[PDB]
Swiss-Prot record:
<feature type="active site" description="For protease 2A activity">
    <location>
        <position position="15"/>
    </location>
</feature>
<protein>
    <recommendedName>
        <fullName>Protease 2A</fullName>
    </recommendedName>
</protein>
<comment type="subunit">
    <text>Homodimer.</text>
</comment>
<feature type="binding site">
    <location>
        <position position="110"/>
    </location>
    <ligand>
        <name>Zn(2+) 1</name>
    </ligand>
</feature>
<feature type="binding site">
    <location>
        <position position="112"/>
    </location>
    <ligand>
        <name>Zn(2+) 1</name>
    </ligand>
</feature>
<feature type="active site" description="For protease 2A activity">
    <location>
        <position position="104"/>
    </location>
</feature>
<feature type="binding site">
    <location>
        <position position="52"/>
    </location>
    <ligand>
        <name>Zn(2+) 1</name>
    </ligand>
</feature>
<feature type="active site" description="For protease 2A activity">
    <location>
        <position position="33"/>
    </location>
</feature>
<comment type="function">
    <text>Cysteine protease that cleaves viral polyprotein and specific host proteins. It is responsible for the autocatalytic cleavage between the P1 and P2 regions, which is the first cleavage occurring in the polyprotein. Also cleaves the host translation initiation factor EIF4G1, in order to shut down the capped cellular mRNA translation. Inhibits the host nucleus-cytoplasm protein and RNA trafficking by cleaving host members of the nuclear pores. Counteracts stress granule formation probably by antagonizing its assembly or promoting its dissassembly.</text>
</comment>
<feature type="binding site">
    <location>
        <position position="50"/>
    </location>
    <ligand>
        <name>Zn(2+) 1</name>
    </ligand>
</feature>
Length: 140
C-alpha cells in the first residue's frame, strides 16, 4: 500500500483505489495502474521533473529502502499478478529488486523528488508507475 500526497491530490495504484477515491476522482488510467483523487489537506510530497534513472524505493515486504537503477518509462509486458492478468502496462520503469503485491504504492524517489510508485513485481524485478510526466499534479 501507499500513496503520493502532492498539493490536494492523492496518487494511488488504480487497483488499490477506494470508493472514496472513485467518488472524488480527478484522473485514472488502467494501462498505467494509476488513479488520482482530491484531498482536503495539502500533502508533503514534491514530484520529480527529470529523466533520472537512479533513485531509492521503499519495499514494505523488507521494511527497507533500496537504491536502484531503473529503465525509462515504457510499454512493457507484465506477467499475471494477484491483482492483474498478464497484460501490457504503459509508463512503467523496471529495476532489479524485490516486489510483492503488497509493496505496491511504495515511493521511488530521486534527487528531484518522487518519481513514481511500485506497481509490478515478480522474477526479481520491481516495476514503478512513473508520475513525472503528469505536470498538472503541480498546479490547480
Ligand atoms: C523534496 C524536497 N527535498 C527533500 N525531501 C526528501 C524527502 O528528501 N530532500 C531535499 C534536499 C534538498 C532540497 C530539497 C529536498
Ligand atoms: Zn530526478
Amino acid at each position: 500500500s501507499g500513496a503520493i500526497y502532492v498539493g490536494n491530490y492523492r496518487v494511488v495504484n488504480r487497483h488499490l483505489a477506494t470508493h472514496n477515491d472513485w467518488a472524488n476522482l480527478v484522473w485514472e488510467d488502467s494501462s498505467r495502474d494509476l488513479l488520482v483523487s482530491s484531498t482536503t489537506a495539502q500533502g508533503c510530497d514534491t514530484i520529480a521533473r527529470c529523466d533520472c534513472q537512479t533513485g531509492v524505493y521503499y519495499c514494505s515486504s523488507r521494511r527497507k529502502h533500496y537504491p536502484v537503477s531503473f529503465s525509462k518509462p515504457s510499454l512493457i509486458f507484465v506477467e499475471a499478478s494477484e491483482y492483474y492478468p498478464a497484460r501490457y502496462q504503459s509508463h512503467l520503469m523496471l529495476a532489479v529488486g524485490h516486489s510483492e503485491p503488497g509493496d505496491c504504492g511504495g515511493i521511488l524517489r530521486c534527487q528531484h523528488g518522487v518519481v513514481g510508485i511500485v506497481s509490478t513485481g515478480g522474477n526479481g524485478l520491481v516495476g514503478f508507475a512513473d508520475v513525472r510526466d503528469l505536470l498538472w499534479l503541480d498546479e490547480e
